[PDB]
């Protein structure tokens, strides 16, 4: 929900730590046409 994002020539990596997550706000939102993952199922993310 921030405004700006990087270019693919110089993609921004940010680190997340010492905090609690929530992925229901992703998986319940049609703002994203895709949310596609290779090592975990999306609904498992909440418990992981």
């Amino acid at each position: 929900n921030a405004t700006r994002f990087a270019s693919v020539y110089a993609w921004n990596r940010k680190r997340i730590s010492n905090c609690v997550a929530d992925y229901s706000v992703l998986y319940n939102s049609a703002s994203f046409s895709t949310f596609k993952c290779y090592g975990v199922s999306p609904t498992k993310l909440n418990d992981l």
Binding site: G39, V40, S41, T43, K44, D47, L48
Partner: protein, 48 residues
């Protein structure tokens, strides 16, 4: 060839459809290991 050898690490990260493709490898590896071990032990059970 499964995502991990801890089977709880399949059952904590994957849903049934894709967890199957991982768990089935773990069944295959283990079952073969037991068909190996029991045949090795049978051949020894005659040495005894």
């Amino acid at each position: 060839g499964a995502i991990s050898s801890v089977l709880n690490d399949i059952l904590a990260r994957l849903d049934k459809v894709e967890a199957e493709v991982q768990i089935d490898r773990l069944i295959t590896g283990r079952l073969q290991s037991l068909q190996t071990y029991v045949t090795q032990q049978l051949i020894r059970a005659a040495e005894i």
